[PDB]
Amino acid sequence: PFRFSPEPTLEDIRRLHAEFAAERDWEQFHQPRNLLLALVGEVGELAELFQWKSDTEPGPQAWPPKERAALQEELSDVLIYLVALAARCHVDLPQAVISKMDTNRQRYPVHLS
Amino acid sequence: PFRFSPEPTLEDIRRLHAEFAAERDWEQFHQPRNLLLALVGEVGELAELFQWKSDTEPGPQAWPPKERAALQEELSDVLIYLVALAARCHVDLPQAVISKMDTNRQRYP
C-alpha cells in the first residue's frame, strides 16, 4: 500500500527549482525551452532506462539500486523539469490537471453493465 | 509572486486518475510501457506547441486562451502519467523531488 506524499505543494516544487535555478545560469535554467528539452531528454533517458525490459520481467523494484535509483531519478527530473516549465508558463498545473481530469473524466464515460 | 495551488497534491491528482482508470479500461493503464508511451506521446503533444515558438515572440507567460488550455492539460497529462508511472515503480514523487535536488545541486554547482 504505497502512497506518495501531500507535500510539497506543486507550488513549492515550482519554488525549489527557481531560487535553485537563480544561483545558476539565468537563460539556462530559465529559458522554458531549456527546461522542456531538459525534460524531453529526461523523459528520454527514462525511455531507455526501460528500453530493453520486459513489460513482464522483474520490474523497477527487482533490479540493482543504481537503476531504481536513477530510474527514480529520470522520474524526479522529468517532473522537476515539468514543474519548472509549468511555473514559467504561469500554468497552475494543480488546477489545469483538474478539468483535464474532469475533462478526460467526461470525454471518457465509465462503462457499467 | 505567481502561484500554482497548494493542492491538488501529486497524490490528490494521483487519486483522480487511479480511480478514473479504475472504472475504465484498467489493465490498459496498468502495463508500465503503456503509461510510458502515453507520457511520451503527450510530450510530443506538448513539444508541438513549443516547436515553432521563437524566443522573440510572446512567451509562455503571454500564451493566450487556446494556448494555456492545451499546455495546462498538456503539462497536466504529463504529470498524471508521471505520477502514475512512479507509482507502478514504487517511487514517492512529492517527497523525492527534494531528495533528488542533490543530483542537481551537484549536476550544476
Side-chain angles (χ1 to χ4, degrees), chain A:
Chain A
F2 151 94
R3 38 164 176 161
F4 285 165
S5 195
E7 56 103 305
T9 298
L10 239 151
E11 157 36 22
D12 320 289
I13 294 172
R14 173 196 73 57
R15 178 155 288 201
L16 297 150
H17 218 79
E19 226 295 321
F20 182 122
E23 355 173 272
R24 296 173 168 75
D25 192 85
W26 205 256
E27 289 320 275
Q28 190 209 325
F29 264 92
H30 301 80
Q31 227 308 321
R33 278 212 180 176
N34 288 40
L35 291 174
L36 158 66
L37 284 174
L39 166 49
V40 178
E42 224 63 288
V43 175
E45 293 298 6
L46 201 64
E48 298 183 1
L49 235 199
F50 272 70
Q51 86 183 320
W52 312 114
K53 306 253 182 199
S54 273
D55 279 304
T56 292
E57 66 179 292
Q61 304 133 192
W63 319 338
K66 301 106 168 166
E67 310 217 63
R68 298 174 86 238
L71 123 70
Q72 197 254 302
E73 289 176 70
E74 319 310 351
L75 293 159
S76 302
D77 270 319
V78 157
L79 180 44
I80 297 178
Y81 293 134
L82 176 72
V83 159
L85 180 57
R88 167 63 170 77
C89 304
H90 291 187
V91 164
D92 177 10
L93 213 41
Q95 274 326 317
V97 169
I98 298 185
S99 177
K100 171 86 264 276
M101 296 211 74
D102 292 2
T103 302
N104 284 358
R105 200 177 306 111
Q106 192 179 179
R107 313 186 170 196
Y108 206 131
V110 307
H111 170 313
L112 297 177
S113 78

Side-chain angles (χ1 to χ4, degrees), chain A residues 6-7 9 53 90 108, chain B residues 5 9 24 31 33 68 95:
Chain A
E7 56 103 305
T9 298
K53 306 253 182 199
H90 291 187
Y108 206 131
Chain B
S5 269
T9 290
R24 279 157 189 88
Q31 243 288 136
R33 301 195 172 180
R68 307 194 86 260
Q95 281 323 289

Side-chain angles (χ1 to χ4, degrees), chain A residues 31-32 88-90, chain B residues 50 53-64 67-68 71:
Chain A
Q31 227 308 321
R88 167 63 170 77
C89 304
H90 291 187
Chain B
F50 274 114
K53 298 296 200 195
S54 311
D55 299 84
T56 260
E57 67 184 288
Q61 297 186 189
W63 281 12
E67 292 202 67
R68 307 194 86 260
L71 166 71

